[PDB]
Enzyme design. Sequence first.
Site, PDB file in Angstrom:
ATOM      1  N   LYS A   1      33.763  51.659  45.973  1.00 39.35           N
ATOM      2  CA  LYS A   1      34.209  51.596  44.589  1.00 39.35           C
ATOM      3  C   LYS A   1      34.190  52.991  43.983  1.00 39.35           C
ATOM      4  O   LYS A   1      33.214  53.732  44.124  1.00 39.35           O
ATOM      5  CB  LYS A   1      33.329  50.649  43.778  1.00 39.35           C
ATOM      6  CG  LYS A   1      33.964  50.220  42.473  1.00 39.35           C
ATOM      7  CD  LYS A   1      33.151  49.170  41.756  1.00 39.35           C
ATOM      8  CE  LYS A   1      33.765  48.854  40.402  1.00 39.35           C
ATOM      9  NZ  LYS A   1      33.167  47.665  39.767  1.00 39.35           N
TER      10      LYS A   1
ATOM     11  N   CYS B   1      36.949  44.715  41.006  1.00 33.70           N
ATOM     12  CA  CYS B   1      36.631  44.493  39.588  1.00 33.70           C
ATOM     13  C   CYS B   1      37.426  45.479  38.730  1.00 33.70           C
ATOM     14  O   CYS B   1      38.655  45.542  38.858  1.00 33.70           O
ATOM     15  CB  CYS B   1      35.121  44.551  39.418  1.00 33.70           C
ATOM     16  SG  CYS B   1      34.571  44.297  37.724  1.00 33.70           S
TER      17      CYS B   1
ATOM     18  N   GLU C   1      33.316  40.305  45.108  1.00 28.27           N
ATOM     19  CA  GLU C   1      32.680  41.612  45.031  1.00 28.27           C
ATOM     20  C   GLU C   1      31.188  41.518  45.328  1.00 28.27           C
ATOM     21  O   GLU C   1      30.496  40.612  44.856  1.00 28.27           O
ATOM     22  CB  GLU C   1      32.898  42.215  43.646  1.00 28.27           C
ATOM     23  CG  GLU C   1      32.533  43.675  43.532  1.00 28.27           C
ATOM     24  CD  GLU C   1      32.610  44.186  42.105  1.00 28.27           C
ATOM     25  OE1 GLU C   1      32.180  43.464  41.187  1.00 28.27           O
ATOM     26  OE2 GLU C   1      33.094  45.314  41.895  1.00 28.27           O
TER      27      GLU C   1
END
Lengths: 319, 319, 319, 319, 319, 319
Positions: free
Chosen positions: B129, B163, B47
């Site tokens: 995200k 994540c 990430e």
Amino acid sequence: TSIYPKFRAAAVQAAPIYLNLEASVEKSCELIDEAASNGAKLVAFPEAFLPGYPWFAFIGHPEYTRKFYHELYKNAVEIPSLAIQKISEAAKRNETYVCISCSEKDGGSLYLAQLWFNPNGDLIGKHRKMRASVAERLIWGDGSGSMMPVFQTRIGNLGGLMCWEHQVPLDLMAMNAQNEQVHVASWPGYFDDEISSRYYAIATQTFVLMTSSIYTEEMKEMICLTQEQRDYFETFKSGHTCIYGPDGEPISDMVPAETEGIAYAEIDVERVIDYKYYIDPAGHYSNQSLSMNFNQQPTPVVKHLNHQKNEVFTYEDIQ
Amino acid sequence: TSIYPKFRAAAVQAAPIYLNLEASVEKSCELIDEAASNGAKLVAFPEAFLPGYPWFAFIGHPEYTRKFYHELYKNAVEIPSLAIQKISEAAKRNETYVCISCSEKDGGSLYLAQLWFNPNGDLIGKHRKMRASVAERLIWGDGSGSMMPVFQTRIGNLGGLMCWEHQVPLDLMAMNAQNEQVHVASWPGYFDDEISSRYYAIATQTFVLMTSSIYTEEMKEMICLTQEQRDYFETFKSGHTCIYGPDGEPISDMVPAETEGIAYAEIDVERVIDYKYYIDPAGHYSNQSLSMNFNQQPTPVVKHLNHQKNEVFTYEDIQ
Amino acid sequence: TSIYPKFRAAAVQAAPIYLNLEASVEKSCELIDEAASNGAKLVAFPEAFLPGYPWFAFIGHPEYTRKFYHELYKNAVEIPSLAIQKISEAAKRNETYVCISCSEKDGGSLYLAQLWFNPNGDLIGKHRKMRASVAERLIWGDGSGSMMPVFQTRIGNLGGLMCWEHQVPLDLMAMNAQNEQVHVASWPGYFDDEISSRYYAIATQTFVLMTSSIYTEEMKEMICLTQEQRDYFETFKSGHTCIYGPDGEPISDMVPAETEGIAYAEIDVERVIDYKYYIDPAGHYSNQSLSMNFNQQPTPVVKHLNHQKNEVFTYEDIQ
Amino acid sequence: TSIYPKFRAAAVQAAPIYLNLEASVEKSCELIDEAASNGAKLVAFPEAFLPGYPWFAFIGHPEYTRKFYHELYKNAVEIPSLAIQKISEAAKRNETYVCISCSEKDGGSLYLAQLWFNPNGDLIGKHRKMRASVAERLIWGDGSGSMMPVFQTRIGNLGGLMCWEHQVPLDLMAMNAQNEQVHVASWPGYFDDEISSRYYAIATQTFVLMTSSIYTEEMKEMICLTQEQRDYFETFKSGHTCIYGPDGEPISDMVPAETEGIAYAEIDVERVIDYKYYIDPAGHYSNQSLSMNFNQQPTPVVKHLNHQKNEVFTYEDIQ
Amino acid sequence: TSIYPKFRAAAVQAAPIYLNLEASVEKSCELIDEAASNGAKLVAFPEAFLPGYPWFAFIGHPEYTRKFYHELYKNAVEIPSLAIQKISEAAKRNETYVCISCSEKDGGSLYLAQLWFNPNGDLIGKHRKMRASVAERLIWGDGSGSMMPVFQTRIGNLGGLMCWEHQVPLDLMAMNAQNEQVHVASWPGYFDDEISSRYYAIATQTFVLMTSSIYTEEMKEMICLTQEQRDYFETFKSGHTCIYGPDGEPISDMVPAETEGIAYAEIDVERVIDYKYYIDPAGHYSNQSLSMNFNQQPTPVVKHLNHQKNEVFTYEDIQ
Amino acid sequence: TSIYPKFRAAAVQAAPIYLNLEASVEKSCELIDEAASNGAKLVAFPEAFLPGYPWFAFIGHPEYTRKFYHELYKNAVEIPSLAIQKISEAAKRNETYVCISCSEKDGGSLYLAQLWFNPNGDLIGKHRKMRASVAERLIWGDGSGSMMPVFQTRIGNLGGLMCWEHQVPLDLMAMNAQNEQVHVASWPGYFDDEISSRYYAIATQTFVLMTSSIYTEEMKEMICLTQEQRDYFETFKSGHTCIYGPDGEPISDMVPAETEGIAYAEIDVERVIDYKYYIDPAGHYSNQSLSMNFNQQPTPVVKHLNHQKNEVFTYEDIQ
């Protein structure tokens, strides 16, 4: 590539030779020369500097406004025209960006525009005011979304709005959607300039050049035809000229009131980042429930298709 | 339609050159070269690999985070940019799919994105995200349903999440409803990643490429100012890089802790059928009382309608 | 419809009993009693008054912020609760419209909301801050377009926004579209209030009650564990509590900084007409090329359709 | 579906009770009663009849105009309102179509509208003036292409334009495109009505009911403060009330100047066919090179999506 | 995709009830019943059958033509209309394709159209005459390129033109470019030459159904007011009705002149292949030097963008 | 650059030697000489002056019109031709702009054109009537948007329209988009002309030269072959010749009815500025919902590409 340049910017507090396009253009050429000889790479001028703000629209009835509108109309800036040539020549000679506000003529109507010139002398674009104020509605037409430009120049993303456009949220969003970094805020002088320009600096994360004009005596001579009109125009408030950082605090000294001068500041475009960290209404600092439509299609009343010129049949070709 | 290929995958454990986009892009190209030379057809990066995860936002107060956000913002990836060209050239040269995470600068804001490149070298799509995690909310904005793509490729239906997106059930359902088959699970290296990734493997019946980053001395020296900060950041635990089958069981060796390496596995997309037999929440394993709304429309703050270029008048044209 | 009443307003400059819900509600009741006894028919409170603004989130890292977020979460306001009952009873007893800001608990999450009460004690509506600013993002969630009310009351069209919502043009646009006339501008006491609230008054043509809290010693003793934290928090500038007319000028005295006190003013809603004459961004002072999409649909994560309760088989029936 | 009925129309030449909506509405009821008692099935009213045309905007400067804009704003017509109720009741009670002009208050802005009622008492439509004249731009905003209705009714295809809208060719073509047959031309009584209405009748092949207002002495007392203003206003020329056939010739009796009276004419919609034979600009009498774009989409500054209502937690529920 | 069906066609020779839409529609329905009951799957009607051809336009000056234009206009065919409903029901109940010509009314002007119905009763399309003949230019307007349809149906590709459109080479090339196979040549009489329809058959490689009208005494009594007109009109020629094959030779029997009847033929679309072998102007029998521009864009005078419906605030809602 | 020159214009009321082009051209030369000797710098002529308006088309049936169309066709103007030569010679000799209407022969078709000559004798441009009126459709073809010129000259922006083009709004918009300032309105003499020309003046902000023809005994005895025809033709009403200012008010004496004469006026093009002030439909007096498409592409039926000149093998070369 996103660059973050540093440069000196000049904001001009001046009055034109009222309703005199030739003298006003000469004055603005002198002012560009002065500012660029003092290190400025961007010179911003007050609102409607060419040939001057229609202060007559606010101190009489529209029939009285008609007579002076005649003289203003005869002194509007056309594209192409000699005034454009003069400003372009000054911009090229001084190797500076210029923002100059003017009364633009397009066909039979007048518009209020900010004309932008680059160091090559090119007229890179213009912005017509979206909506005119209370009595400016007698003189100028409305703008369109096709003319709200932000230029990705070598001294940052440059844009500008005029007077009460800073109090229109959708204009702020249109400018913040295109990532404007250095902003020119042109004011005429009578309306309140401080709060709006500082708020714009804060809410768009922009260095704001606030440029405003002053009142001269010859203007009062020309347009005040009675004593009552004279006193009423005397009650008008004064504007201010200053430069603000992206936090809203000034970075230059205000020009003395009712005098002619230029304000200078060191624009460091790298500072806008520290306030994009806090807020970016067109970016991270947003909510999906509220959005806006920005229509940039040209909207002339008559759209020309396959426009062609007239070919003359000469007298010799006829005989 | 409905193809079940077999290929070799590569999950990368590595750190970037912290907040240095050019060096990190060079390292990413080298890692892609190594993975493709070892025979992989898909390469996944941790990430925020370009230019690194903002750990400075977890060991100080927001004004401390602002200074390093400045450097990160100056080093974000833009679309288009040189970083995109380098990664696309690496993908085309090595004829592999690439999923690389980065900080993405759109407008004046930053987002956390996963970029996808196909063997022809095109940028086939990106996933921002959806929701930034604890203290990432100071750095990155939120994504939208329009940027949650599943690519129907020659090596299966590929997709990814970052994540804590693996602990939001609606993201699992959005991926499942698109019939995801091979999942790249990017993690930064500090949050427990094993359980969430294995559960994702089981619940979405996908092969999961779990990739994590490691800490370096350059990062520690850069972002640690006091000694208390250094000690607090020394307690952060390490991530893991491993590949799982659609049963949640590993199909490759976990890479040694806090070391650079690449995990390789043999992905058999045909294997997902035997677990779609057991369970498929978006298909036969549903109940009519529960349903999901997947709004895939774009959600920009400002919609640009009829975006059209305006003409420019050159100096020579004016003169 | 379209009335223009005259009434007395009261903006409050006070601090709560930090992270103490009961004492904060008691203080709020006392302040409402005092303001109403001094003739005020509208009382407004600082941002996040109940039980306090999370200043801890700005002087440490997320893990330190977590410990105090625990105690804030334990003192959040719920609807229904005892706090809502006490504030409603005070509003009914004093026959005053009350706008009070607080941390609102909805299920597992916390939100920042302004709660509105009328002279009958009815909780007539709430507005949730549509986006957290910097470190409030660690504390609170986002609001929805369905929580941007403007109440048509016996004292005009009321509404409110908190802190940097005034620097978001779309929020101003949504508030202006509903013909808001008297606006409550709640501020926490560390950000820059004057420019934003004054510009809001000008741009929306509304009266603005700017309310701001102060820093108390007990707060510092609670949240300044070390000496660096104490010194860093000591540099936090204070806010101001004033009231403005639709032209952006103040109509009351500034409450002394860092002192508890109330600013009163006489609100003649008729004055807004004289400025709708000048500008009205949602009405005459618009351009058809720009427009806003105001979406007011409720946006919870999970819609509870056909909600129903459970059949509690009591012990007596079973035997 | 094509019908060509016969009926009696009534053009009203009258003044309102200046800036008094209740009295103007009552006079409108009386005038509708009188017109209908003489067999009139359509009743048309002067421009801005409710509560009166803003003459003050033409005899002073904008700040003088602001004072009377206050009174006009307090007396504008809202939809719904008592004035709409009473005009609807009159239209039903007299079983007549009514075209009445007014100042429409929509939010915080004023608009100049024509309201259409049918014999059942419905508000069947609404036309807002597309553009405002030399003055009156200070008073009214612009309309939209979504408010230029032509009603297919029991007495033909009805429509209307106000004052200088008859000198705007594209408004004429917008009405002609919809096959308008009977037209209401509302005039305030200072501009030259006859030529424009006659040309409209010829170009659109419609009957034109031209209705102008008259100046009263109460109006002069109200808006003429000085002697110079009174003298300047006393030079304003009056309008006229005529009814014209599809060829432009008058088919009724001109109302005596400066007198309150109604002009009645016998309308035979079938006569339009003999002139569609000659000319039909929107149909057979056209050239493919010249076409028109007619955008009828709504153009509000802020459009509401999924509008909702704010529920209230009554006091008896909170406790 | 390409089919070559075999079916029976029928060309009608009749006259309407002059300038009487209801009776003419009834007679057309009866003729459709007669033709389909005889096995015909395609039924073609003369030019301007509904309500009748404007012969009056050819035997007097324009003012005399005006009187009868009044009646023809009042009896023109609208879409939708009762006439359309009846013809659609006849085509449906007989399970036949129908090409009926009429005086179509659209807005305020008249057009000369051919209307096409399928065995399901649908109105599959319409063709408007591209240019009206000499005195027809008084009555009808011009058609557009968007209304030159060829229908790909179960009885082959169908199309049609009206008198003297077969003498315009570009109309022939437009029909040939769409691969027309069965063609309806509609004539009113007094223009009809066999040459034009036979040439069309040969040049487009189509079967041609030539349909003409006859003269009734009701027509002569109605339009021939004076003896001179009666004699001059009695001079008028009589048309012919029959069917031609792709070589131009007849494949049916002539209907006796100036009497009512139907011509029948077996149409085998396969025969067109043996003549596409010889010539195909739009295909192989062409030269690059010569080309045709076929613009099929709609060309109405006013384009209605975002067309909206009229809303009424009903009487009860007002009260 | 824009100019506002002053000059004297001449409007001609005359009749030609009917259907005699040489005598008519002689009469035109004499009238140009007379008008220009009186100071006129512009000379305008009636509609279809060379060789005369086809009055025969309005008093008989098309076959009767055919015989006289034969002669009009034989007497139509061509470019180049001797008529063009003579008119150019007169225009040059008199140093005057000339606008003259005529029947133009182009190929095998006749058109109604306005021919413009400058003081140098150059045929600067031509305007064909866009759409023929009732019976003119038998005589003349249609125009195109490529032939709607506005000439920028030393005496203002000049343009023209013919008869009922003044009742076509899109024609007015086409002239207004090009910023016309002085306009020639040539009428034949039987259609009403005062109202249409006055409205054009007002709605285009132009000085209007309204020129009209008269009737002669030679015409009546040439076309009226029957007593009934003569009586019908003698009822035709007379046109008028006059010059109007930008406000629609006359600025010259009307030529006595049914007599030859020229009208003179002083045209101050600067006066149009006083009426652009409060109306300009193509500029500021416009709404964004109503726009016009103006296609100026040449629209010939056949487009010649790479026109050549045929080689001739002279007899001597062959032998």
